[PDB]
Amino acid sequence: RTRLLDSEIKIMKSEVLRVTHELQAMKDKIKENSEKIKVNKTLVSNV
Amino acid sequence: EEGMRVGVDRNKYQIHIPLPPKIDPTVTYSDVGGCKEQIEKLREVVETPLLHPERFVNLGIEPPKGVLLFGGTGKTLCARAVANRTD
């Protein structure tokens, strides 16, 4: 069961990686999606 | 309501205080007895619903309330002979 400590370390790493994904996605998405909505809200064209 | 010149932001174009400065100024009988047959049908269609919704309602037929007129015929003069009679 000595590998349980390394598994807990890897699980904390996975939790920190999920939190970092949460940051980089949602926090940055506040800004990005908000700018997209601004362009959508604040103010039709052809390909 | 779509089709109205409404107020709208100069920058964001968000809708603002509207106004229709386009307003109302856009729209402008002894002859009873003319072309003979026309007179009776006109009289019925105009007055009988306006006066007696019984000749049809009790009859179940509907009150004649419209005319498909077609014709120096006098499409207005008929409406005015009706104006003698509508009220």
UniProtKB/Swiss-Prot annotation, chain A:
Residues spanning the signal sequence: none
Modifications the protein undergoes after translation, according to the UniProt entry: Sumoylated by UBE2I in response to MEKK1-mediated stimuli.
Subcellular location per the Swiss-Prot or TrEMBL entry: Cytoplasm; Nucleus
Free-text function comment from the UniProt entry: Component of the 26S proteasome, a multiprotein complex involved in the ATP-dependent degradation of ubiquitinated proteins. This complex plays a key role in the maintenance of protein homeostasis by removing misfolded or damaged proteins, which could impair cellular functions, and by removing proteins whose functions are no longer required. Therefore, the proteasome participates in numerous cellular processes, including cell cycle progression, apoptosis, or DNA damage repair.
Subunit structure as annotated in this protein's UniProt entry: Component of the 19S proteasome regulatory particle complex. The 26S proteasome consists of a 20S core particle (CP) and two 19S regulatory subunits (RP). The regulatory particle is made of a lid composed of 9 subunits, a base containing 6 ATPases including PSMC3 and few additional components. Interacts with PAAF1.
Family that this chain belongs to: Belongs to the AAA ATPase family.
Disease: Deafness, cataract, impaired intellectual development, and polyneuropathy: An autosomal recessive disease characterized by early onset of deafness, cataract, severe developmental delay, and severely impaired intellectual development. Patients later develop polyneuropathy of the lower extremities, associated with depigmentation of the hair in that area.
Name by which UniProt lists this protein: 26S proteasome regulatory subunit 6A
Species per Swiss-Prot/TrEMBL record: Homo sapiens
First-to-last residue of the parent protein present: 44 to 93 of 439
From Swiss-Prot, chain B:
Annotated disulfide bonds: none
Keyword Nucleotidyltransferase: no
Binding site for ATP: 71-76
Assembly and interaction partners: Component of the 19S proteasome regulatory particle complex. The 26S proteasome consists of a 20S core particle (CP) and two 19S regulatory subunits (RP). The regulatory particle is made of a lid composed of 9 subunits, a base containing 6 ATPases including PSMC2 and few additional components. Interacts with NDC80/HEC; this interaction is detected only during M phase. Interacts and SQSTM1. Interacts with PAAF1. Directly interacts with TRIM5. (Microbial infection) Interacts with HIV-1 Tat.
The name this protein goes by in its record: 26S proteasome regulatory subunit 7
Alphabetical GO biological process terms: osteoblast differentiation; positive regulation of proteasomal protein catabolic process; proteasome-mediated ubiquitin-dependent protein catabolic process; ubiquitin-dependent protein catabolic process
Gene Ontology molecular functions: ATP binding; ATP hydrolysis activity; proteasome-activating activity
Induction per the UniProt record: Expression is not cell cycle-dependent and occurs throughout the cell cycle.
Function: Component of the 26S proteasome, a multiprotein complex involved in the ATP-dependent degradation of ubiquitinated proteins. This complex plays a key role in the maintenance of protein homeostasis by removing misfolded or damaged proteins, which could impair cellular functions, and by removing proteins whose functions are no longer required. Therefore, the proteasome participates in numerous cellular processes, including cell cycle progression, apoptosis, or DNA damage repair.
